[PDB]
């Protein structure tokens with residue numbers, strides 16, 4: 001009368017141990033109450049099941065390509081002069097986790113309500129954790145679903161779903177969320193200007209899609225290479241250069257950043 | 272004695288008289304400007320600034336580089352006249368008068384940016400690449416860039432300073448073209464009864480044009496329920512319903528004027 005446990009991943013080869021009682025002593029394996037082997041004779045038809053015999057008294061049960069259906073107690077009854085000896089083995093077949101459905105990469109507008117979904121299998125059933133890959137760690141409470149109400153431009157990026165069950169390495173998939181928003185002028189600063197020399201105005205801006213920059217002065221649009229000015233537009237900024245800053249140039253300049261979702265303005269005088 | 276007065280300012284060359292009936296006289300190198308209250312110069316900029324009676328200072332308005340040189344004030348006295356020679360030095364803030372215009376070049380070409388400026392003293396010209404990852408460049412009118420890479424594009428700043436007033440600063444936009452590169456291609460969950468997606472992120476200047484091929488067969492935006500969304504930096508293939516007929520190796524292609532490139536990915 002003995003008991004033992006054994007845990008094996010799905011697919012592995014299990015070897016349930018059993019020892020015979022010297023010569024003229026045979027063994028027999030049971031599956032709950034179904035006979036698998038008795039001595040050298042096989043009762044099971046499962047080709048995965050065999051007897052692994054290394055020593056003359058080794059009567060271990062060898063199950064190949066184990067599956068979750070094999071879970072349960074296996075009993076080895078050993079013949080003897082007196083009451084047979086019973087060695088019982090509880091087989092538990094575990095399955096690594098695997099995500100089988102996750103929200104696909106998306107593009108949404110700022111302020112909308114988003115819900116990410118992640119579903120995974122595994123034995124034991126896995127715990128599903130969400131995580132936002134950003135300098136702000138912000139570990140999110142567990143759950144298959146991550147609700148994001150009023151999504152901000154700062155909440156964009158890759159989101160990581162992690163399904164763990166302590167069996168093996170957890171499965172990890174990602175989702176790319178792009179948040180579109182109307183442009184925002186973060187800064188507008190002009191440089192010093194010697195009278196006869198040139199003047200510069202930076203206009204830093206953000207926006208998804210990237211914003212198109214325009215420059216104005218009193219409702220009149222300024223153009224590159226016309227009237228003695230130079231507008232150089234970059235991905236995140238635009239620079240207005242006034243060649244010769246005479247007294248007839250002072251005034252309020254206005255930078256404009258617009259995309260598909262909206263616009264924005266910012267004014268500044270020329271020093 | 273020396274004095275520095277940048278162009279346009281009003282210069283006041285100081286010369287104080289001795290007590291009693293002592294008159295002064297100002298010279299320009301060796302040309303007489305004033306003698307007492309009488310003016311020899313015709314320059315209307317030149318006058319005598321007098322606070323108290325002993326003040327015989329010379330007031331030059333709107334100074335120019337032509338006024339550079341020594342000025343001498345001779346004041347009569349009981350013995351040899353007393354002199355107060357002052358060397359006037361007129362300085363000029365720097366001014367860029369020619370700078371390379373915004374340009375577009377291919378990757379690997381040899382580029383030379385130019386920036387020329389005047390100023391008194393002659394200004395030092397500094398080139399600077401406005402980029403998070405960049406190394407400053409030696410001063411000089413010319414910035415040589417051999418084998419320009421896509422990472423060397425962006426905003427270049429010429430700054431000409433001579434410590435007089437504020438420095439002049441102009442900029443140049445350099446665009447570097449290069450053949451497109453597919454940085455990533457990723458598919459989501461493959462499951463009948465759900466939507467399938469394949470994103471294809473790519474870079475390229477000019478921006479690349481995206482094409483999709485299913486097992487060497489081109490795909491169209493409305494061919495058997497599929498949807499192709501082409502953006503500036505990525506293309507997304509959306510299979511409405513993932514039937515068994517859509518399984519296979521999908522191929523994203525990104526091409527521009529300078530070249531092309533592809534990247535494949537299977538579904539299950």
Ligand SMILES: *[C@@H]1O[C@H](CO)[C@@H](O[C@@H]2O[C@H](CO)[C@@H](O[C@@H]3O[C@H](CO)[C@@H](O)[C@H](O)[C@@H]3O)[C@H](O)[C@H]2NC(C)=O)[C@H](O)[C@H]1NC(C)=O
Nearest residue numbers: 031032034036044045046048049063067068069070071072
């Ligand atoms: C130990 O005993 C258990 C329980 O009797 C055996 O599990 C039985 O295992 C087989 C094969 O793993 C299962 O069969 C299958 O049926 C499903 C449909 O239900 C089919 O999709 C599969 O292809 C396969 O034909 C069977 O359901 C399962 N019985 C129970 C009650 O769960 C196990 O095989 C035994 N181990 C041995 C003999 O080594």
Ligand SMILES: *[C@@H]1O[C@H](CO)[C@@H](O[C@@H]2O[C@H](CO)[C@@H](O[C@@H]3O[C@H](CO)[C@@H](O)[C@H](O)[C@@H]3O)[C@H](O)[C@H]2NC(C)=O)[C@H](O)[C@H]1NC(C)=O
Nearest residue numbers: 299300301302304312314316317331335336337338339340
């Ligand atoms: C002090 O003396 C010097 C010379 O001893 C004077 O420089 C002279 O300055 C005048 C104007 O200030 C110059 O004349 C101009 O010439 C330009 C062309 O160069 C012309 O476009 C103008 O219309 C004007 O005619 C003159 O050339 C220059 N001579 C020299 C030798 O430098 C200076 O003006 C005197 N400053 C005083 C008295 O405050």
Ligand SMILES: *[C@@H]1O[C@H](CO[C@@H]2O[C@@H](C)[C@@H](O)[C@@H](O)[C@@H]2O)[C@@H](O)[C@H](O)[C@H]1NC(C)=O
Nearest residue numbers: 377378379380381382383415416417418419
């Ligand atoms: C680009 O320049 C190559 C040589 O650059 C040379 O190396 C630099 C560092 C300087 O020392 C310069 O004086 C040298 O001449 C040429 O071999 C190459 O042909 C040039 N490319 C083109 C398109 O002309």
Ligand SMILES: *[C@@H]1O[C@H](CO)[C@@H](O)[C@H](O)[C@H]1NC(C)=O
Nearest residue numbers: 111112113114148149150151
């Ligand atoms: C998002 O959720 C808020 C409450 O958190 C609700 O007021 C709003 O109507 C929701 N928006 C959508 C589009 O469901």
Ligand SMILES: [Ca+2]
Nearest residue numbers: 369370371372
């Ligand atoms: Ca030129």
Ligand SMILES: [Ca+2]
Nearest residue numbers: 383413414415
């Ligand atoms: Ca050179």
